[PDB]
Design a protein around this ligand. Structure first.
Ligand SMILES: CCCCCCCCCCCCCCCCCC(=O)OC[C@H](CO[C@@H]1O[C@H](CO[C@H]2O[C@H](CO)[C@H](O)[C@H](O)[C@H]2O)[C@H](O)[C@H](O)[C@H]1O)OC(=O)CCCCCCCCCCCCCCCCC
Ligand SMILES: CCCCCCCCCCCCCCCCCC(=O)OC[C@H](CO[C@@H]1O[C@H](CO[C@H]2O[C@H](CO)[C@H](O)[C@H](O)[C@H]2O)[C@H](O)[C@H](O)[C@H]1O)OC(=O)CCCCCCCCCCCCCCCCC
Ligand SMILES: CCCCCCCCCCCCCCCCCC(=O)OC[C@H](CO[C@@H]1O[C@H](CO)[C@H](O)[C@H](O)[C@H]1O)OC(=O)CCCCCCCCCCCCCCCCC
Ligand SMILES: CCCCCCCCCCCCCCCCCC(=O)OC[C@H](CO[C@@H]1O[C@H](CO)[C@H](O)[C@H](O)[C@H]1O)OC(=O)CCCCCCCCCCCCCCCCC
Ligand SMILES: CCCCCCCCCCCCCCCCCC(=O)OC[C@H](CO[C@@H]1O[C@H](CO)[C@H](O)[C@H](O)[C@H]1O)OC(=O)CCCCCCCCCCCCCCCCC
Ligand SMILES: CCCCCCCCCCCCCCCC(=O)OC[C@H](CO[C@@H]1O[C@H](CS(=O)(=O)O)[C@@H](O)[C@H](O)[C@H]1O)OC(=O)CCCCCCCCCCCCCCC
Ligand SMILES: CCCCCCCCCCCCCCCC(=O)OC[C@H](CO[C@@H]1O[C@H](CS(=O)(=O)O)[C@@H](O)[C@H](O)[C@H]1O)OC(=O)CCCCCCCCCCCCCCC
Ligand SMILES: CCCCCCCCCCCCCCCCCC(=O)OC[C@H](CO)OC(=O)CCCCCCCCCCCCCCCCC
Ligand SMILES: CC(C)CCC[C@@H](C)[C@H]1CC[C@H]2[C@@H]3CC=C4C[C@@H](OC(=O)CCC(=O)O)CC[C@]4(C)[C@H]3CC[C@]12C
Ligand SMILES: CC(C)CCC[C@@H](C)[C@H]1CC[C@H]2[C@@H]3CC=C4C[C@@H](OC(=O)CCC(=O)O)CC[C@]4(C)[C@H]3CC[C@]12C
Lengths: 24, 239, 43, 101, 40, 33, 390, 49, 189, 406
């Protein structure tokens, strides 16, 4: 009965940030 | 006191009215599907006020009025500023729909382009339907009508000032750029006149409330509901 | 069909509270308790 | 001070949106998926299979068709990296078996 | 008095023996009492 | 067929009683108070 | 009942003077137009699929043949070929519109009320007609049939005292109103006066004329027409230009409106039919059966228009289906023969409707020519002025 | 019966906390079982757990 | 009388919850600013009767907010950025200077409006003369005050000008302007 | 083969008389199946028992502390009230008590959506709701029945007479009047009369009991016509006959004599009896009770006789209604037994006024209003069929999906 929304992706780690500068 | 009596009486009147309205709604949903005890007279759903509140108002009114007696129309010039039951911006909506359809047909036959007549007739039809539903401003259609009218005139202003008209293309590139012409100005005057009159209806449609609106709410079941919806059903409610 | 409305006057809940708890509070849990009793009984 | 008090009482939803929702649950996942699919050559092990594993490990739940993550992955990764070629593969290997060539 | 007594008996009331553990009126009873003052 | 004389008799009842129902209401007005 | 009981010889010479096939007998007061429904056999109210599907698909095929013939030679056709295709398509649409008017009164397929209401709405749309306003106006007609000052959703005749009132109110016969009335009730454009009726629907586009518990239904009723004239009418123009619009839409429209107007005008107007105000001698069964006319068609036109001229078999029985309207008439003449009235297609009848029967006078209780009436009420103005010089 | 129905909420909090939130009960963090001296209070916890 | 059960001589017009917070307690209906901490009337009442100042504060700020000012829409979540800039991203000193400038400007605007109102009363007194033709050079203080407090819609003043110029009757005034409700559309604004 | 202007009128007559017969049959169809239940309703209500009220508040109260709330059908209720708060009770015979309780309970239970009390400036302000012969000017504020002792034999004021009235209005009925009078010598009377409104075509109801030292000396009950032909509608006659077969069986038919003032008002089935013993009295009581209840249940479905402009038939019908009601009205005051009872004690100048304004007053231009309180039927309804507010539904689906785990 939730909504159609994302989850957090960074409550566990930080590695995902490594993806933004590289692509930039 | 005399100052707390008023508070109590306004609370009571508001509660009586709310319960009568809930009754009208639930009785309509029970009678439109058969299960009504056959003494039910379906004309009761037309009594708007409430029987109790009405008796109170009638008694008070007769007491007041008994104890106080211990174009142009030269008999009333202010005939327009009188409540007839419909929205004020009602003949403007129909006038603009007629103007739109007439200009659409005229220009799209006198040139040969197929866009102006389609736009003009669509705008005219939607504004005519809106000006029809705006003929009873007390009901719910009287509100969805103003909504539809504002939406259509806003879309007109948008298309004009941001994309311009196909039949107004020229060879240059700075002269064939979209500016604001007459029909856009009229549509903008319409949106402004709608907003300055009454568009306050159907106010319970908005984005749903966050867990940030129920942080200090005094009710636990509501807050748990909101958290559960927004994806936080597991967080502990140390509250 | 389906209707979400409250045909109950809140003064009745207030009266029941004052009676049984001066001789929890007015929230949605109370109204839900009411509905649960009604349903499990009428069956 | 009085103005800040009145303004805080009328804007709780917008406040929680901008402080908790705007980046962490709206903009960052979009950016991360688009960025990953911009890199990461057009295979299936890289465009679909490893994204799912890493998304479930990070977010702590599997992306099902009930979630926006599954649909973002599907569209970008599958439709724009493996489909324009697996389409030719099926058009040259499996459709001849059936009636129409 | 007679009319209101008839109505109240048919609406419901707590029997003397059935009370093991009347400060205010419910809402239907108030509609009935107001109308009864209007009629009689 | 019954589905059709049903409609027939119903419209007939309506058309025959209209005139009396117009007068019974000119009556459900002066009495209540 | 205006030229009631007297020897049948003079009523027959009147019927031959007016083109009428018959003149009614005497009808006594105190009756209900639903009475004579007890005579019809219990099988005349039967339902069957084949007759209905024929009644809907035959004028459809007529219209489709006409369009195909036109689009085959879209605009290179001469004028009278265009007129032939327009007449054919308009007749097919009059038939489809009678099917519509059937499902509006709920007597077409009572088995599926939703499907039949949707069919009525869809088929009324291309003519710009709202189903519920039509149904309300038709019941309001049935209730006040041939009543003075009360049936304005039929062919309400123009009377004498009101025309004298307007004569004084305009200060002569030279104003716009008098000229408009003259030109509309004197030339064959009268045969298209139903167009004005179409403008009297959309009751100002105003929900304040209706019952609140009906609003959401009335608006949807105004939706299907509007949507049409908002979506399809542009497309046609876009793909056909002005002329290509006066061809594939406007002419079949004028044809259908001609058919409608003449059907009604000849069904309920005649010199042997008086128009009484109720209280001053009105009656339901009398003004229903005695003040009516039934018209004759060639069986091709009768299978096309779908029995569009039998209005009495379904005024004695409002629930009588459509493929049974002739058969029921077969029974009615067996019983009320002397009181019925009948007529046929004749340009003489129309010419007398145009030139002779123009103004209704309540003194002689009959119709008179407009120029004689206008000169004579000018003479009565001379009279009242003679009484006014002193 | 008293303690039966006043711990039929402890049991369900142990089973389904989301159901008890729907009853205005935020959380149960600590309970006391009082009685007359000579109660054998450890007897209940067995069947409860 | 659509009402089946009860129909008093005055028809029932439904009441709906308000959509905006009332003027504070301190502001005049006009354009001039207020005394900026304490109203002048507070000095002519008993000390035990001026709890209404702080009570009105508590009401407008925390206790009676009409549920139409807490609607979450796409427009309000950008107005949030604007307001949060103004309240957290600007130093109070610049805010104070802007405040002083705005106060001065509004005072000048009020003076201009008052002059315009006086000129309007002259013109209307002059036109009612042509209207009634005869003796009345008068106006109505009612209309002057209603013009100074913005209580007339433009249609009302137009109808009043016509009525004056045609029949005089300088004491026949348009009914009143009613308060504008808060516009709402959908999740949009 | 065709028809003539005379058989179509025959056809309209056929149809309309058939319709009248149909509705007249529909009226009696309900009584026909079981007539014994027109008197035996109270015993059945007692048999079925107390009913447990189940509203959400009632259930909540019952589950919090212990309290069960009970209700009773209106027949049981009007049997607990009895001759409830009449001021002249305790001196009224037990038969008159039974009859008054039953009649007023019927009025309260059957007409409870429009039963107003008659306008008070007509009877209750002059003080005609309680009348004493020792205090005709009302200087004891209406407590004379308590402050003044009974006069002894030969004293001024013997024999003392006192009356108590009650008058109601309603939708169909323009006056429902009950009155009880006692004299000191031992005479007690009871006089009931129910008048329909001038716009309705129904017969008048009337009942009189007169008893002397606990022995009924005269008992008459009549559902009396209002037409000039003195014949009721088929349902009225059918019901009276069916009821006489049900209750008056085994009773002397030669006792229902027609008094000299009777046949001018009496329906051919009217009853006038001088009972002999307990059996005659019990049978007559059950019969009068069932007849009154039937009369009211029949009025429950009545429709006014409206005279549309253009119809003279209905105007003549309304004129006939007026003539019949007035004929009965001035034909009842010549029942000079009770009138001489009144005039031997209260005088004549007071009796003329009291009688002409209350007893059998007739004023075609005056019928009082009534108060239509049917909307209450809604409120009570929605107290056993409530709907809860869109938030209890989530919780109830939670509870259903939780308990069904097992
Ligand atoms: C009725 C007369 C038609 C007319 O006037 O109508 C002309 C327009 C309405 O025509 C609309 O015209 C639009 C295009 O307008 C633009 O183009 C027009 C000529 O193409 C004019 O220049 C107009 O100012 C300019 O904005 C589109 O074609 C719409 O489909 C068509 O309905 O009204 C107008 O000028 C605007 C009217 C302002 C009155 C307030
Ligand atoms: C030329 C005059 C500026 C002189 C000055 O000291 O110019 C720099 C000033 C900063 O002035 C500071 O202004 C401060 C203002 O503080 C006051 O206001 C502050 C709120 O801003 C705090 O409330 C603080 O407590 C309160 O005292 C104090 O006066 C500091 O002493 C003073 O350095 O900025 C400015 O004029 C603003 C610069 C705008 C550039 C864009
Ligand atoms: C100048 C024309 C009249 C001014 C006008 O806008 O009228 C608008 C007025 C306002 O209309 C009335 O306004 C009242 C104000 O409260 C109420 O709202 C009434 O419901 C509303 O009908 O309506 C009319 O009088 C219609 C005539 C205008 C038609 C103009 C066609 C273009
Ligand atoms: C097809 C299948 C049909 C089956 C259904 C048959 C149903 C038959 C009943 C239909 C009812 C239609 C009634 C027709 C009607 O009343 O019209 C007849 C009505 C006249 O009728 C009366 O007329 C009076 C005078 O106006 C009043 O308006 C009365 O209210 C009106 O009833 O037509 C008019 O309104 C004509 C006046 C308007 C002026 C005409 C302008 C024409 C414009 C030019 C035309 C274009 C150039 C050509
Ligand atoms: C300038 C913008 C115009 C809108 C200002 C409205 C202000 C107002 O109150 O008006 C005054 C009145 C409205 O009247 C107000 O009605 C309200 C009802 O909600 C309340 O009763 C207010 O008290 C009453 O003043 O305006 C009218 O009656 C209609 C005026 C139409 C103005 C729009 C003109 C622009 C339309 C151009 C389109 C032409 C296309 C053809
Ligand atoms: C493809 C889709 C095409 C869409 C087709 C739609 C076309 C519709 C176009 C309609 C044209 C709109 C203008 C109509 C004007 C009108 O009818 O006024 C109606 C008003 C009455 O309004 C009324 O008056 C009523 C009260 S009373 O009449 O005054 O008694 C009151 O009930 C009501 O609220 C009020 O409005 O009539 C007046 O008294 C005349 C004064 C109006 C002021 C100037 C207007 C005259 C035209 C000037 C140009
Ligand atoms: C992307 C944007 C899409 C928008 C589409 C077009 C919308 C048209 C403009 C909406 C009408 C204005 C509504 C209104 O005035 O609200 C009141 C708002 C504040 O919003 C209110 O502010 C209140 C808090 S407070 O005032 O800021 O303290 C609060 O009660 C409430 O939630 C909030 O709405 O007051 C303003 O100052 C708005 C002025 C600027 C609007 C014109 C700019 C045009 C854009
Ligand atoms: C703050 C910086 C604002 C600059 C706006 C971002 C540019 C996106 C447009 C890319 C494009 O032209 O779109 C076209 C391009 C296709 O070639 O699309 C793509 O694949 C590009 C998708 C890859 C995602 C790029 C990540 C950018 C994040 C760097 C900001 C670090 C922000 C943190 C603060
Ligand atoms: C100012 C700029 C940055 C745009 C801001 C957009 C947000 C306000 C939007 C974007 C995504 C939206 C969400 C996307 C999907 C849903 C599900 C959808 O659910 C419903 O329809 C619930 C209906 C109800 O139960 O009332 C609407 C709410 C919600 C959470 C939306 C709430 C509003 C959000 C956060
Ligand atoms: C332009 C064509 C090809 C497409 C179809 C257009 C119709 C949907 C329009 C054209 C004529 C319009 C009618 C013209 C005149 C009026 C009167 C007008 O109302 C009034 O004038 C109110 C009464 C009054 O002023 O006395 C608006 C409704 C109505 C029926 C209009 C309804 C909409 C109609 C039928």
């Amino acid at each position: 009965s939730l909504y159609f929304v994302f989850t957090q992706l960074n409550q566990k780690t930080f590695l995902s940030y490594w993806l933004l500068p590289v692509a930039g | 006191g005399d100052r707390m009596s008023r508070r109590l009486e306004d609370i009571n009147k508001a509660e009586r009215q709310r319960v009568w309205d809930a009754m009208r709604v639930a009785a309509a949903h029970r009678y439109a599907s058969g299960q009504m005890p056959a003494w039910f007279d379906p004309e009761w759903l037309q009594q708007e006020e409430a029987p109790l509140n009405a008796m109170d108002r009638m008694r008070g009114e007769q007491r007041r009025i008994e104890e106080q007696q211990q174009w142009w129309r030269e008999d009333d010039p202010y005939w327009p500023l009188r409540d007839w039951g419909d929205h004020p911006m009602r003949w403007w909506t129909l006038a603009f729909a007629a103007i739109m359809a007439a200009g659409g047909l005229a220009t799209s036959v006198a040139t040969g382009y197929v866009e102006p007549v389609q736009a003009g007739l669509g705008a005219g039809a939607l504004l005519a339907l809106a000006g029809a539903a705006m003929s009873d401003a007390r009901c719910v259609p009287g509100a969805l009508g103003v909504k539809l009218a504002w939406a259509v005139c806003a879309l007109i202003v948008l298309k004009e000032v941001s994309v311009g008209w196909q039949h107004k293309r020229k060879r240059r590139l700075a002269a064939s750029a979209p500016r604001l012409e007459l029909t856009g100005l009229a549509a903008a005057a319409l949106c402004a006149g709608y907003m300055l009159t009454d568009m306050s209806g159907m106010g319970e449609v908005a984005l749903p409330p966050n867990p940030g609106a129920v942080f200090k709410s005094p009710d636990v079941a509501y807050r748990a509901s909101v958290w559960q919806k927004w994806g936080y059903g597991q967080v502990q409610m140390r509250v | 069909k389906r209707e979400g409305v409250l045909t109950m006057n809140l003064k009745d809940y207030n009266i029941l509270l004052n009676q049984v708890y001066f001789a929890k509070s007015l929230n949605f849990a109370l109204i839900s308790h009411s509905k649960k009793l009604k349903e499990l009984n009428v069956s | 001070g009085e103005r800040i008090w009145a303004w805080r009482n009328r804007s709780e939803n917008e406040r929680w949106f901008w402080e908790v929702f705007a980046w962490d649950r709206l903009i960052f996942p979009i950016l991360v998926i688009v960025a990953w699919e911009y890199l990461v050559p057009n295979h299936l092990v890289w465009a679909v299979l490893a994204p799912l594993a890493l998304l479930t490990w990070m977010s702590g739940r599997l992306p099902t068709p009930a979630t926006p993550e599954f649909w973002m992955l599907a569209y970008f990764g599958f439709y724009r990296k493996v489909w324009p070629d697996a389409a030719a593969w099926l058009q040259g290997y499996v459709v001849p078996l059936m009636g129409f060539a | 008095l007679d009319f209101v007594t008839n109505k109240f008996i048919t609406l419901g009331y707590i029997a003397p023996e059935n009370a093991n553990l009347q400060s205010e009126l419910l809402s239907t009873k108030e509609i009935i009492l107001t109308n009864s003052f209007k009629r009689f | 067929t019954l589905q059709n004389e049903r409609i027939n008799k119903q419209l007939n009842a309506f058309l025959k009683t209209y005139k009396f129902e117009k007068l019974i209401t000119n009556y459900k007005k002066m009495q209540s108070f | 009942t205006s030229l009631d009981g007297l020897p049948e010889t003079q009523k027959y010479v009147y019927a031959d003077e007016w083109g009428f096939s018959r003149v009614g007998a005497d009808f006594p007061p105190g009756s209900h137009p639903s009475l004579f429904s007890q005579l019809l056999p219990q099988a005349l109210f039967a339902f069957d699929a084949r007759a209905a599907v024929a009644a809907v698909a035959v004028p459809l095929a007529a219209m489709a043949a006409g369009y195909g013939w036109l689009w085959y030679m879209h605009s290179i056709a001469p004028v009278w070929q265009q007129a032939l295709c327009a007449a054919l398509i308009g007749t097919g649409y009059a038939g489809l519109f009678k099917v519509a008017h059937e499902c509006a009164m709920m007597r077409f397929i009572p088995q599926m009320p939703g499907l039949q209401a949707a069919l009525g709405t869809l088929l009324m749309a291309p003519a710009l007609y709202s189903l519920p306003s039509w149904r309300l106006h038709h019941l309001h007609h049935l209730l006040h049939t041939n009543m003075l000052w009360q049936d304005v959703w039929g062919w309400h005749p123009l009377t004498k005292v009101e025309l004298a009132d307007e004569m004084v109110r305009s200060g002569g016969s030279g104003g716009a109103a008098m000229a408009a009335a003259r030109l509309v009730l004197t030339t064959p454009i009268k045969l298209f006066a139903s167009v004005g009726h179409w403008l009297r629907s959309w009751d100002g586009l105003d929900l304040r004329h209706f019952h609140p518990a009906s609003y959401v239904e009335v608006l949807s009723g105004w939706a299907a027409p509007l949507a049409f004239a908002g979506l399809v009418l542009p497309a046609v123009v876009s793909a056909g230009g002005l002329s290509g619009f006066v061809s594939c839409y406007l002419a079949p429209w004028l044809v259908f409106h001609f058919w409608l107007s003449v059907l009604s005008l000849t069904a309920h107007t005649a010199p042997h039919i008086p128009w009484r105000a109720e209280g001053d001698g009105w009656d339901a069964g009398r003004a229903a059966v005695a003040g009516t006319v039934t018209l004759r068609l060639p069986r091709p036109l009768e299978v096309l228009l779908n029995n569009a001229n039998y209005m009495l078999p379904q005024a004695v029985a409002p629930g009588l289906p459509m493929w049974s309207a002739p058969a029921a008439y077969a029974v009615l003449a067996a019983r009320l023969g002397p009181y019925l009235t009948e007529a046929s297609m004749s340009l003489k009848l129309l010419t007398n409707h145009v030139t002779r029967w123009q103004i209704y006078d309540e003194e002689a209780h009959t119709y008179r020519p407009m120029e004689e009436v206008v000169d004579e009420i000018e003479a009565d103005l001379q009279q009242l002025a003679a009484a006014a010089q002193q | 019966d008293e303690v039966k129905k006043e711990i039929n909420e402890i049991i369900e909090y142990l089973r389904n906390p989301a159901l008890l939130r729907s009853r205005g009960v935020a959380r149960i963090g600590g309970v006391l079982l009082a009685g007359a001296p000579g109660t054998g209070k450890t007897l209940l916890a067995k069947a409860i757990a | 009388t659509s009402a089946p059960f009860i129909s008093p001589m005055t028809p029932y017009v439904p009441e709906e919850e308000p959509t905006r917070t009332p003027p504070s307690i301190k502001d005049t209906g006009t354009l001039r600013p207020a005394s900026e901490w304490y109203p002048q009337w507070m000095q002519y009442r008993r000390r035990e009767d001026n709890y209404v100042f702080w009570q009105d504060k508590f009401m407008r700020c925390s206790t009676d907010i009409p549920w139409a000012e807490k609607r979450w829409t796409l427009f309000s979540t950008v107005w949030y950025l604007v307001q949060q800039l103004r309240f957290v991203g600007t130093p109070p000193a610049l805010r104070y200077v802007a405040f002083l400038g705005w106060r001065a400007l509004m005072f000048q605007v009020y003076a201009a409006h008052k002059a315009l109102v006086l000129w309007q009363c002259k013109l209307d007194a002059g036109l009612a003369r042509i209207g009634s033709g005869g003796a009345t050079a008068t106006f109505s203080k009612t209309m002057a005050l209603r013009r100074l407090h913005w209580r007339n819609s433009p249609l009302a003043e137009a109808l009043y000008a016509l009525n004056l110029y045609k029949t005089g009757r300088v004491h026949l005034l348009p009914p009143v302007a009613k308060p504008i409700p808060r516009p709402t559309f959908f999740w949009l604004f | 083969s065709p028809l003539s202007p005379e058989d179509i009128m025959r056809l309209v007559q056929q149809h309309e008389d058939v319709a009248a017969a149909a509705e007249s049959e529909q009226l009696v169809a309900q009584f026909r199946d079981d007539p014994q239940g027109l008197y035996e309703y109270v015993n059945r209500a007692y048999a079925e028992g107390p009913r447990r009220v189940t509203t959400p508040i009632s259930l909540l109260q019952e589950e919090i502390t212990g309290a069960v709330t009970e209700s009773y059908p209106a027949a049981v209720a009007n049997d607990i009230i009895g001759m409830g708060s009449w001021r002249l009770k305790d001196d009224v015979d037990p038969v008159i008590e039974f009859l008054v309780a039953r009649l007023e309970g019927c009025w309260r239970e059957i007409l409870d959506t429009d039963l107003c009390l008659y306008p008070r400036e007509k009877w209750k302000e002059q003080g005609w709701d309680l009348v004493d012969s020792m205090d005709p000017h009302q200087e004891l504020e209406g407590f004379s029945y308590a402050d003044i002792p009974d006069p002894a034999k030969g004293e001024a004021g013997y024999p003392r007479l006192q009356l108590e009235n009650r008058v109601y209005c309603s939708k169909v009925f323009r006056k429902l009047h009950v009155e009880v009078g006692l004299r000191q010598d031992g005479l007690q009377v009871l006089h009931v009369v129910v008048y329909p409104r001038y716009s309705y075509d129904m017969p008048i109801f009337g009942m009189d009991i007169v008893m002397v030292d606990g022995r009924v000396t005269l008992a008459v009950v009549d559902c009396c016509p209002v037409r000039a032909d003195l014949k009721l509608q088929p349902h009225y006659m059918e019901t009276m006959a069916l009821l006489q077969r049900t209750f008056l069986e085994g009773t002397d038919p030669a006792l229902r004599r027609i008094p000299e003032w009777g046949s001018k008002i009496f329906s051919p089935l009217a009853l006038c009896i001088t009972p002999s013993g307990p059996e005659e009295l019990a049978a007559f009581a059950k019969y009068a009770v069932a007849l009154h209840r039937a009369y009211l249940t029949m009025s429950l479905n009545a429709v006014p006789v409206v005279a549309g402009p253009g119809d003279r038939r209905e105007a003549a019908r309304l004129q006939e209604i007026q003539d019949g009601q007035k004929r009965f009205c001035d034909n009842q005051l010549v029942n000079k037994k009770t009138r001489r009872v009144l005039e031997v004690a209260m005088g004549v100048e007071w009796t003329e006024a009291y009688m002409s304004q209350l007893m059998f007053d007739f004023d075609p231009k005056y019928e009082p209003p009534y108060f239509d309180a049917s909307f209450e039927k809604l409120y009570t309804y929605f107290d056993e069929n409530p709907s809860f507010g869109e938030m209890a539904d989530e919780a109830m689906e939670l509870e259903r999906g939780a308990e069904a785990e097992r």
